[PDB]
Each structure stands twice: as C-alpha cells, then as structure tokens.
C-alpha cells in the first residue's frame, strides 16, 4: 500500500479543515491540495485526504466517497462537549458504510491549545480505549500533533 485514503469526520467547527490545511501546506489560517507524500516508519507513502464538510445528509454518493476511505479520523473539540457527544454517531456511520466492525480509526481531540476545556483527556482516553482505537490530542493552530494524528491513522491501516 503506497497510497492511503484518509477521511476526516467530525462536528462542524471542530477544525477538520484546519487540520488538513496544517498537514498539506502546511500552515494555519483552502481547496488547493488534498494530497501529500511522506515517510512513515521507514517507508514512503502517498496520502489522499477527504475533508468532510457541510451538514450531515442522506446521500448515496457520499456513502461511496466515504467507502473509498481506508482510514478515518474522528475529530472533536475539547472546548465543545457536544462535538465529543457526537463521536459515537460518526463511528456508527463509518461502520455502516464500510460494513465492518473493525475499521482503521483514530480519535482526535483538537484545539488543545485553548486554556478553557470542557472535555478532559482521561474521559476521551477511556472512550478510545473502549473502541480499541488510539487517541491523540492535536492543535492545528500551533501545529501540535497534527502529523501525529494522520500518521498514526496510517499505522492503523498497516496493522489491518
């Protein structure tokens, strides 16, 4: 697998676009590019990123688009409890589309640079530990853990 399809899912305003932009460009503020060549664990690989945008809706095409993805990032905001609440929702949707219980997935806690938090790290770790998926706190603004989140998702795909 020299090529990887990655889909970023999450609530509106959690920073999915900012995470993708801070991966490709890579700076913090764009549909210019969604593709990057990087080296992970001594092996080069190409990454295609689907930055899911807009309200959730029924769509046969969107299902096909997500089904193309091999790995999924579940992003929530630490200052948004409601975004963390919807994590179970995005997970079930992914399992529904991929038609599998074991889908390569990584739980992402974004905006960890903000001093005011509503969801603690432990509460998020316990959720990811029950799913059997890794959990990484990221910050698109300070470019903290951005690469770590996507690269770990690549590891998850390689293990499966």
């Amino acid at each position: 697998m020299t090529e990887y399809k990655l889909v970023v899912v999450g609530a509106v305003g959690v920073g999915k676009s900012a995470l993708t932009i801070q991966l490709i460009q890579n700076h913090f503020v764009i549909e210019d590019s969604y593709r990057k060549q990087v080296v992970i664990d001594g092996e080069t690989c190409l990454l295609d990123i689907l930055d899911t945008a807009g309200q959730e809706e029924y769509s046969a095409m969107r299902d096909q688009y997500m089904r193309t993805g091999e790995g999924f990032l579940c992003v929530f905001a630490i200052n948004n409890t409601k975004s963390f609440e919807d994590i179970h929702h995005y997970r079930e949707q992914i399992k529904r589309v991929k038609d599998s219980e074991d889908v390569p997935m990584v739980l992402v806690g974004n905006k960890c640079d903000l001093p005011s938090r509503t969801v603690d790290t432990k509460q998020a770790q316990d959720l990811a530990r029950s799913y059997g998926i890794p959990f990484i706190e990221t910050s698109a603004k300070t470019r903290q853990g951005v690469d770590d989140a996507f690269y770990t998702l690549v590891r998850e795909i390689r293990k499966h």
């Binding site: 590019s33 190409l46 930055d51 899911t52 807009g54």
Partner: peptide
C-alpha cells in the same frame, strides 16, 4: 469552485492530485 480538468498531457501524478480535489468537491456538492 469546480476543479479544472487535468488535460490530455496530465501525468499520473497530476491525475492523482486532481482526483483528490474532485473527491472533496463531489462530497461537498452533494
């Protein structure tokens, strides 16, 4: 905001780059 066609002279890499942008565009216009 629809991505321009890669063209006939486009290489495989150019097609991959286009496909990724088309991937996000098609999802968004649904």
């Amino acid at each position: 905001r629809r991505p321009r066609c890669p063209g006939d002279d486009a290489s495989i890499e150019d097609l991959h780059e286009y496909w990724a942008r088309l991937w996000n565009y098609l999802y968004r216009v649904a």
